[PDB]
RNA sequence: AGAGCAAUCA
């Protein structure tokens, strides 16, 4: 049935004695027990498919039986002759294999009893802290000091005192103040030549050098005296342009000092006099009158007043002005990295009236100067006692000079995100503080003041201000460490967890280097002391204390979880040093491989002899062996039901029989890191053709090779001599030529210059130096990051025997659909036959790159080659559907909603069954376990998967052999290549200081090899489905083992993600005797110890610290759920709103952040934080791209200057507008709703109607838009235009010019936003030529069409190129149908300007600085002038825009979601009758969705957390617009190649005449009007489509659809929140 | 002086 096709060519290959390795024989020989022998285990293993015989085809049964007979013949036994004999043997087997679970149960009970007695008990938390400090002191001697005057800087690198007096005025004020007598006073750091030098330097630079000037602020130094030069040079000598000093955790002096620091900072913040600014304007717009974001304003009146009071406190506590000063100073410091030299300096002044920075030429050093009044002098001295060098007095003021500093670009960006970070932290902490929010509710907005506060509330406010500043201005790494400890130290209020003292004893890092984080450490210590003192409301009886903001009288656990996780998630990412981070990341697999190698008996040099028979129920690296195959057989038998249907579904849905470019994963542009090196033949032939007469004529590769071998002769003479001996016959000739070269004197030599030799030279030089350096009878290679699409193009070229690109070979074959194609497994078998040949095993080589994981500890990403990527795709996608049939598995998720769906399904099913089973039973106990495995990749085995390939009943004999061969080569041939820069750094350090090395220097033979072996550690992310299938198999085996206990009945449930586990267990019966036998005091303790023992038997290492068992709380990955009620956890979206952006435009960034705003609205956030989230995303977008109000490059200012009739809130977001949509259309529809509402409002205003029903009823009748356009034309002709008509003209022309926009040569088969408009304005990216030159498709393009196309004859070549494009339009119009449409499309992608900038490699952090430099520049006109001429061209009428107006009206009206949301939003009853009976943020739930998911019916909920569908798919019209605009563009290029003044053609061919008729009018609009009435819908056989009609079908029906209706669905409420009433 | 703790950037 269903025509089972042989999907391989390896039909005659068996898993044993036919594949490349004989490891299967000793895998078998290591599996024999005392009761089950060799013929028994091979009978079961190679013939257990007979249970899956009712649902397989006859060819499948015959092939598997022939494979069984061949394998049993190969393994030297007598096979069974018939199926009935095999079934009789198999039922005898199933008896002797079912007699194992009792032995396994006794083994885990003995293991639990053995592990119980070995532990040591920590007496208390203080002793745990002392033991951690003692072991850290043993690791680092003399680290702890008692002198506080030698620690690090306290208040980061920033100092912002408030100023009381209302660019050159501040500078000459500092000039006037800095000319008094020398009354310089120095201070001790905690109660002096550098201070004298810096004081003389600042007084010289402020007296004699500031008045040669440039750019009104930057001055140099040449024409001054010798004494002034000496003072300046001493100042820069001071500037410079283990040694750990730590303080203990039990210091009370640091606590008192930090309390005084907090009080002095709060006194300092209450002195500012400014009341206008840039951040203040946007935040006061969004939060001063927050009723403009809601629809039903009158039904809630406490929430909006609380938001207003928080905004008033932010205004009165200088939060906005402090953030503005930080952002301005960071922008100035980023800008100051310019073409200046070391003898010139810059003066930086922000809008603050008395703060000055002296910036000099790693970073930019600077000096800060402040002028404080007499009343705040002592508080300034206390608050900044660490960082004051000197101060003096002038009149009634004090002048302060601060220390020299230095900052990196990432820290400058982190300080640049201060207005996004700080105010939302202030808002959330002030909301979560109970006494603060009740005082704000008690007092009125006219009477809230700082000086009217109770002392407790004032202390809470001081803690909130200090915590908000220290969170939003994070620069160091000790804060990152203590917040990671605060992340993992929240497991106190649960049951048995085994990390109340062990986690603090092991994983705590006492890296306290200043006195500000002593506050956080004391807060977490107070919380743990209170917890150890001894749905769910917490803190009303625990009486605990918030870690950041003290905040007594806690309401719920949700507030503390959100506060702590917001503090975790609002840290930067890329703050680690590159060399140290990469050495640690390369050191972890080296030691984790040396541990396995030294444990299991292998020495360093030998290979990976697979099974030593020590992989049998041991501790470190072992499985049971004879239990794993029974568990896998039982899992397959209970899981796989229909083998033929499952195989057919795999072949259809995953596309095994499709060509490789039809696979989405193997086609997209990622990095694959192939190997590339210059061969030795090139080097020796370059040395042969090197001419002593042409020493001065050496340019390029010859010079690079010559410098490399000159450095090799200077450093490793014997190595180079033996290299010449083993690679050239005329070694003496090469040696004497070397002597003649080095005796010429026309070259340059180099000493030890660290990584600068790599940095400022050619890569060819350093790679030939490494190759000539590390010659040890081997081949050393480096890795270069290539592209996946480019490697697929090269592989498709190589499969068709096209070694070199030929003009006629590609074009001669591939006619139509019925031309030559290929399949994925044909390519895979060709690639495997290539890679099995002897080539040095270069295909299995991995490069390691650094991921950014927001923590001080860092993860890594691995780059595997194309061949290994294809075998991993094969394995991981033939195991994808096996996980899709498992209901207890959660890697086959439909996004993020399904995770919560099956988590709540597990919890509510086990709670319901416990409530059912509790009635009239003997005893009942329930437990849950949130588990996290220790090391999922390094500590696990890989030969456990070979045992799982064989038992698969889906596969047949021949594909399982190929998978076994792939895995056996993957284990044995894998190695990791060290990057060249850190390799040379390690070699230099070992040469000059160490002469000995660590585990990496033991795996490498004394740092003489670039690559080191890693074998049993399959790297992270490579096997994500197989490991989860094995995890579920292990859990099912655990349940079947628990079934064997006689006294009690156990029911287990589990949810499996890779490296995750959420187990739940109900036990009934003799629970006391059961717990006595299991040596546990409670069921969570039993579950913890039994799961640990069983997983250790299944080679899965459980982490005893970061895993906890409880009785009512489950945590799968996040968003913990208690008693069937979920905890929201919106703080991830809250922190993502303020930190992460794409930095590609303003429009795209605004929609990307609005996605997070919508998701935060769906996750159930309080009403107060919503305007601050609006302001935060607006501050980020406007501060990076379209400048925030108060400066040049605005948009409202440009509109006001040009006098456009649109209002301030009517600007669309593509023109630089603001996110001004209401909240319910945002939460339901999405970020495109503001553009839709703007267009709908101007459409209703122009058509003079009242309701959407009337508008659509008038539009649906014909002869209406024509008469409206005729009336508008007559009004423009007479000149009696109105405001509504001008707005409609502007928006019609905006929609018409959005089709043109700029850089619109993109194919864009799938868009990101599905928005109605386009981007319109794009700053040109940083485009190079070297990265374009490295591409092999670019080399093929430059070889096939010559160097005239590299960057008369060029015109005719481009004419021929577009002629062959016009002759085959399917190449540029469709994604590649077959061969002769993919590779030549890749060559065709390089034609014309503005098509080669689609290949971009700029990171998201190196693009923001480029955009900051680019926006204040000419890229040539300007940004503001480009915008001004765009509105000047847009304000005119322009003719034949009726079709654009009609399509705009149709696209607005036709949306079913909009047309069903708008009347029910306009006519929704406000409250009651089971709508709005609660008011504590229980209106954000009901009025958001309950009329809507009752309008779109199928629900009964009142309080829910939503995971929505992709119902707003507004992308079925923009893709036709893009496709026929692309066809119009290439037709325009062809006809402009033909002739000029193309308005009417000269009667060429039929395609030219039809394209002339197309572009006489608007082609996209008239083909839309044609497809509106025609219903052809041809079958796309690529034969009759050209026969029927060329142009209109070829750019109408070839987008696989026309303009049709959308679909609505009921928003998919995952599960309820806890219902309140 | 500042950043970091593989003996690193200035």
TrEMBL record:
Residues 916-1098 form the RdRp catalytic domain. It comes from the Viruses. Keywords: Transferase. One of its GO terms (biological process) is viral RNA genome replication. GO terms for molecular function: RNA-directed RNA polymerase activity. Its EC number is 2.7.7.48. The keyword Transferase applies. This is RNA-directed RNA polymerase L. It comes from Tomato spotted wilt virus (TSWV). The chain holds residues 316 to 2090 of 2879 of the full protein.
């Amino acid at each position: 049935v269903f025509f089972s096709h042989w999907t391989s060519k390896y039909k005659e290959r068996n898993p044993t004695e036919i594949a490349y390795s004989e490891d299967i024989e000793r895998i078998i020989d290591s599996l024999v027990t005392d009761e089950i022998t060799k013929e028994e285990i091979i009978h079961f293993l190679f013939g257990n498919f007979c249970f899956h015989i009712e649902t397989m085809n006859d060819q499948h049964i015959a092939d598997k039986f022939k494979g069984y007979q061949s394998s049993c013949i190969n393994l030297k036994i007598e096979p069974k002759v018939d199926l009935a004999d095999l079934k009789d043997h198999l039922i005898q087997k199933q008896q002797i294999w079912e007699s194992l679970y009792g032995k396994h149960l006794e083994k885990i009970m003995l293991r639990i009893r053995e592990k119980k007695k070995k532990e040591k008990e920590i007496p208390d938390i203080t002793t745990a802290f002392n033991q951690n400090a003692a072991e850290y002191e043993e690791k680092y001697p003399n680290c702890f000091t008692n002198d506080l005057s030698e620690t690090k800087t306290n208040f980061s690198m920033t100092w912002s005192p408030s100023f009381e007096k209302i660019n050159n005025a501040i500078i000459n004020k500092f000039r006037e103040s800095f000319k008094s007598s020398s009354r310089v006073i120095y201070n001790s750091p905690y109660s002096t030549n550098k201070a004298r030098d810096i004081t003389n330097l600042v007084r010289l630079c402020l007296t004699e050098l500031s008045c040669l000037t440039r750019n009104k602020n930057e001055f140099c130094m040449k024409e001054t005296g010798r004494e002034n030069k000496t003072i300046y040079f001493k100042g820069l000598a001071v500037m410079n342009i283990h040694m750990k000093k730590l303080i203990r955790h039990d210091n009370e002096d640091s606590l008192s000092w930090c309390e005084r620091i907090k009080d002095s900072l709060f006194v300092l913040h209450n002195g500012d006099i400014r009341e206008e600014g840039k951040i203040t304007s946007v935040y006061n717009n969004y939060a001063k009158n927050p009723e403009c974001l809601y629809i039903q304003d009158s039904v809630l009146k406490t929430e909006l007043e609380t938001c207003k009071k928080i905004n008033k406190l932010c205004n009165d506590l200088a939060i906005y002005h402090y953030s503005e000063d930080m952002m301005q100073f960071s922008k100035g410091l980023m800008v100051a990295d310019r073409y200046m030299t070391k003898e010139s300096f810059k003066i930086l002044t922000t809008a603050n009236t008395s703060m000055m920075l002296l910036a000099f030429k790693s970073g930019v050093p600077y000096i800060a100067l402040h002028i404080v009044d007499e009343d705040m002098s002592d508080q300034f001295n206390i608050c900044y006692t660490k960082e004051i060098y000197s101060y003096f007095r002038n009149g009634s003021n004090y002048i302060y000079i601060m220390r020299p500093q230095r900052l990196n670009q990432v820290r400058l960006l982190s300080l640049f995100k201060t207005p996004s970070k700080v105010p939302v932290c202030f808002a959330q902490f002030s909301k979560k503080a109970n006494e603060m929010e009740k005082w704000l509710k008690n007092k009125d907005i006219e009477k809230v003041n700082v000086f009217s506060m109770t002392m407790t509330v004032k202390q809470i406010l001081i803690n909130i201000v200090f915590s908000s500043v220290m969170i939003g201005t994070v620069t160091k790494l000790s804060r990152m460490g203590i917040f990671d400890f605060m992340r993992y130290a929240g497991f106190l209020p649960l049951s048995d967890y085994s990390n109340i003292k062990e986690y603090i004893r092991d994983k705590f890092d006492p890296d306290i280097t200043n006195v500000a984080d002593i506050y956080f450490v004391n807060g977490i210590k107070k919380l743990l002391f209170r917890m150890e003192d001894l749905d769910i409301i917490g803190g009303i009886t625990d009486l605990n204390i918030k870690c950041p903001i003290t905040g007594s009288t806690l309401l719920t656990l949700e507030d503390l979880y959100n506060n702590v996780y917001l503090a975790i998630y609002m840290m930067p990412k890329s703050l680690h040093n590159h060399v140290h981070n990469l050495t640690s990341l390369l050191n972890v697999p080296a030691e984790w491989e040396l541990k396995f190698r030294k444990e299991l008996g292998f020495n360093i040099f030998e290979d990976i002899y697979p099974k030593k028979a020590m992989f049998d129920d041991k501790d470190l690296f072992s499985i049971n062996g004879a239990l794993n195959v029974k568990a896998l057989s039982d899992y397959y038998l209970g899981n796989i039901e229909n083998v033929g249907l499952m195989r057919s579904e795999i072949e259809n849905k995953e596309d095994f029989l499709s060509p490789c470019y039809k696979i989405s994963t193997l086609k997209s542009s990622k990095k694959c890191s192939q190997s590339n090196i210059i061969s030795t033949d090139e080097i020796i032939e370059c040395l042969q053709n090197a001419k002593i007469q042409d020493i001065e004529n050496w340019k390029g590769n010859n010079l690079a090779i010559i410098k490399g071998l000159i450095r090799t002769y200077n450093e490793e003479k014997n190595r180079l001599v033996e290299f010449f001996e083993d690679n050239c016959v005329n070694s003496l000739y090469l040696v004497e030529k070397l002597k003649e070269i080095i005796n010429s004197g026309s070259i340059t030599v180099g000493k030890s210059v660290t990584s600068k030799f790599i940095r400022n030279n050619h890569p060819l030089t350093v790679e030939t130096y490494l190759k000539t350096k590390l010659y040890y009878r081997n081949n050393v290679t480096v890795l270069k990051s290539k592209k996946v699409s480019e490697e697929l193009y090269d592989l498709v070229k190589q499969f068709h025997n096209m070694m070199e690109i030929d003009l006629d070979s590609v074009m001669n074959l591939g006619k139509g659909t019925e031309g030559k194609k290929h399949t994925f497994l044909q390519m895979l078998e060709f690639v495997m036959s290539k890679a099995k040949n002897v080539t040095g095993s270069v295909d299995f080589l991995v490069s390691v790159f650094e991921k950014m994981q927001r923590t001080k500890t860092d993860r890594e990403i691995y780059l595997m080659s194309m061949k290994v990527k294809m075998m991993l795709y094969f394995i991981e996608h033939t195991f994808k559907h096996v996980a899709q049939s498992d209901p207890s598995e959660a890697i086959s998720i439909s996004g993020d909603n399904k995770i919560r769906a099956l988590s709540t399904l597990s919890l509510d099913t086990i709670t319901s069954y416990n409530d059912i089973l509790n009635k009239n039973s003997k005893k009942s106990r329930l437990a849950f376990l949130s588990a996290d495995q220790s090391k999922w990749s390094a500590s696990d085995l890989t030969y456990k998967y070979v045992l799982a390939i064989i038992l698969n009943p889906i596969l047949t004999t021949g594909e399982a052999s190929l998978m076994i061969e792939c895995i056996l080569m993957y284990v044995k041939l894998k190695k990791v290549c060290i990057p060249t820069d850190i390799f040379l750094n390690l070699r230099k350090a070992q040469g000059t200081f160490g002469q000995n090395e660590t585990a990496i220097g033991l795996l490498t033979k004394g740092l003489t090899t670039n690559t080191y072996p890693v074998s049993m550690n399959w790297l992270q992310g490579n096997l994500n489905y197989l490991s989860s299938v094995y995890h579920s198999c292990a859990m099912k085996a655990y349940h079947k083992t628990l079934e064997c206990y006689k006294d009690c009945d156990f029911q287990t449930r589990w949810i499996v993600h890779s490296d995750d586990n959420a187990t739940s267990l109900i036990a009934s019966g003799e629970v006391d005797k059961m717990l006595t036998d299991f040596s546990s005091s409670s069921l969570p303790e039993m579950l913890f110890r039994s799961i640990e023992a069983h997983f250790k038997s299944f080679c899965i290492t459980l982490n005893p610290k970061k895993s906890y068992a409880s009785s009512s709380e489950v945590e799968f990955i996040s968003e913990r759920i208690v008693n069937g009620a979920i905890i929201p956890l919106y703080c991830r979206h809250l922190a993502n709103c303020c930190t992460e952006s794409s930095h590609i435009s303003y429009f795209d960034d605004l929609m990307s952040l609005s996605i997070h705003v919508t998701m935060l609205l769906r996750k159930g956030c309080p009403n107060e934080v919503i305007p601050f989230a609006y302001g935060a995303v607006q501050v980020q977008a406007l501060s990076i791209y379209s400048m925030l109000p108060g400066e040049v490059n605005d948009s409202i200012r440009i509109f006001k200057k040009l006098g456009v009739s649109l209002k301030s809130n009517e600007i669309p977001t593509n023109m630089g507008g603001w996110l001004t949509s209401p909240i319910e259309p945002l939460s339901i529809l999405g970020p495109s709703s503001n553009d839709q509402i703007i267009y709908y409002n101007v459409i209703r205003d122009f058509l003079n109607k009242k309701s959407l029903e009337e508008v659509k009823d008038s539009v649906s009748s014909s002869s209406y838009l024509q008469m409206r356009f005729r009336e508008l034309k007559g009004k423009y002709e007479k000149g009696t235009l109105e405001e509504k008509d001008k707005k409609m003209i502007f928006l019609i022309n905006l929609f018409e010019k959005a089709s043109v926009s700029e850089d619109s040569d993109v194919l864009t088969i799938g868009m990101k936003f599905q928005t109605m408009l386009t981007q319109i304005i794009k700053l040109p990216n940083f485009i190079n030529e070297n990265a374009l030159n490295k591409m092999s498709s670019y080399k093929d393009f430059s070889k096939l069409y010559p160097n005239l196309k590299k960057n008369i004859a060029s015109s005719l070549e481009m004419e021929s190129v577009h002629d062959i494009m016009i002759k085959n339009p399917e190449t540029i119009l469709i994604a590649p149908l077959n061969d002769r449409d993919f590779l030549l499309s890749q060559l065709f992608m390089y034609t014309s300007p503005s098509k080669r900038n689609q290949l971009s490699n700029q990171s998201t952090e190196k693009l923001a600085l480029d955009r900051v430099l680019r926006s204040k520049a000419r890229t040539k006109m300007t940004y503001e002038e480009n915008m001004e001429k765009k509105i000047l061209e847009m304000l005119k009428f322009d003719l034949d825009s009726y079709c654009s107006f009609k399509t705009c009206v149709n696209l607005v009206i036709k949306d079913v979601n909009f047309s069903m949301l708008i009347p029910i939003l306009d006519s929704a009853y406000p409250c009651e009758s089971r709508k709005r009976d609660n008011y504590n943020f229980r209106w954000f739930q009901t009025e958001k969705w309950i009329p809507v998911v009752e309008g779109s019916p199928g629900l009964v909920v009142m309080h829910a957390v939503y995971g929505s569908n992709y119902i707003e798919n507004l992308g079925l019209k923009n893709i036709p617009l893009t496709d026929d605009s692309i066809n119009v563009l290439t037709s325009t290029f062809g006809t402009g190649l033909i002739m000029e003044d193309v308005k009417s053609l000269v009667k060429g061919k039929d395609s030219f005449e039809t394209e002339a008729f197309s572009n006489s009018n608007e082609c996209q609009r008239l083909v839309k009007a044609c497809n509106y009435m025609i219903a052809a819908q041809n079958r796309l056989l690529a034969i009759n489509t050209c026969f029927t009609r060329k142009s209109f079908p070829f750019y109408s029906k070839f987008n696989l659809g026309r303009g049709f209706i959308s679909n609505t669905l009921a928003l998919l409420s995952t599960i309820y929140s806890k219902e309140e009433s």
